[PDB]
Design a protein around this ligand. Sequence first.
Ligand SMILES: O=C(O)[C@H]1O[C@@H](O[C@H]2[C@H](O)[C@H](O)[C@H](O)O[C@@H]2C(=O)O)[C@@H](O)[C@@H](O)[C@@H]1O
Lengths: 266, 266
Amino acid sequence: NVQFSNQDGALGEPANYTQFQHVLTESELQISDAEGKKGNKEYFALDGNFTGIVNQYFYVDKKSEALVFKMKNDHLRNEVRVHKNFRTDLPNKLYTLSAEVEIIDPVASMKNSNSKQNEITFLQVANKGLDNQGTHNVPHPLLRVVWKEDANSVKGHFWAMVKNNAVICKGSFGKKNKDKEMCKADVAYKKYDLGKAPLNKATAFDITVGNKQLIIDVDGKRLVEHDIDYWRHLLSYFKAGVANQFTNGMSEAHFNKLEYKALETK
Amino acid sequence: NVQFSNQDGALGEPANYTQFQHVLTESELQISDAEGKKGNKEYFALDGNFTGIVNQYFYVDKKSEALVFKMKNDHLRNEVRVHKNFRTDLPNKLYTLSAEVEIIDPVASMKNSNSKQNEITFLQVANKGLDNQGTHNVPHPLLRVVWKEDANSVKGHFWAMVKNNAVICKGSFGKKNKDKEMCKADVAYKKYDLGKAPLNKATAFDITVGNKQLIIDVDGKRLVEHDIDYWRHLLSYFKAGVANQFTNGMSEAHFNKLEYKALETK
Ligand SMILES: O=C(O)[C@H]1O[C@@H](O[C@H]2[C@H](O)[C@H](O)[C@H](O)O[C@@H]2C(=O)O)[C@@H](O)[C@@H](O)[C@@H]1O
């Protein structure tokens, strides 16, 4: 069971900080019990009410006012999940997630890892499926924004890992596709270098989905403008926090800013 | 297996009739061996060349110049399949199949049937899938235009059977959905009455797919204008001929007209 405690006032409660209040009301918390079963997940603030929701892994640092996410162990996660399952294909509906993030001591996080991946995912666009119930879910996110230890000798960069078709390539429903060209790592994904991650400094990310486009700005500069016509049928949603693709360590992300905005016109 | 012959000149060869040449060049023939096993199907004119393709089940009546499709037995078929796998969701791309059809003595065709369906399908909009290879095919056609013996005491009408979502509701990939509300017959399909089939007279059908609409005109009159936004990701295609959903008899359709036209602009 995941617990809540502000450690006698040491930890700030996220719902008490105006800069995070709106995104919190628009979301729920999906967090693993670090010492529970593999890949486990608990849900809180199902209604968007984060009042009282705080613990050692999810809090606001009272001095910096950063929203802090932590999690230990491979495949465990700690994320705010924005509730809207939005269409990505319409010209008059644009959905934006804006963040300023610093990943804390990621090389140390990964010291004892033997993962071949060695990534921390801190922003994501997932699909729900064809409908709000998750029918025909595709078990691949549209986007993962990650800190990656070593990508063919390029060390400590941020990357956007973009799923570049709508094909199921793993699991029970991917058996017919997994060995085809469309499921090869270099075909099913397009990767964008978002730059070397800086030390002791936050980096701004702005992700806009809509009008058949996935747009990513980094520190105010447009780096990704990717056509996602192929994803048109999939209702999609934002997550932010940490998700571990490395073993035997704890990740830690500090968000100086986390915002969500829907721009629906006409 | 399927053999070709004009019966010493008695049968007209479809490729020799100018009014059918264009649709044929744009299609292939998918036809069953009438004596073979349920569901069997053979393929001819893979390149659109129908020269020499004629037999007692697929011919032009030399007197009337009707293109004749016949087939006997349950779940056997005899259809031209138009090659283009088109998008249905774009405003500047519309795809039209136009036919004038007469179903010959269908009550006699079904005289010995024990099928609960008792339908002859003679026009169809199918999906290929997400791509030309058929990835993630949905095993349900978007549309079937049929002659139906009896639908809730309404006898001998034409119907448009329209699949009203993009959900797989049967087969190995439908197990998770098949018992849900979205797969119930009354939800998964919308049925339109296209009128009582006339005696000894052809009926015109014009099917237009594109711009997120499925339109059906019957003798010029717009009877179906259905929003197909839900099908947007599925590349789709036309078939025309006969497909039997009844047992122990022979279907026969006479097409005075069969045309295909793509209206692609910018
Ligand atoms: O397949 C990928 O692109 C990424 O999948 C991730 O696992 C998914 C998993 O398939 C489920 O959808 C689950 O709900 O979420 C996981 C996720 O991390 O979002 C990871 O395996 C990631 O490395 C893959 O690259």
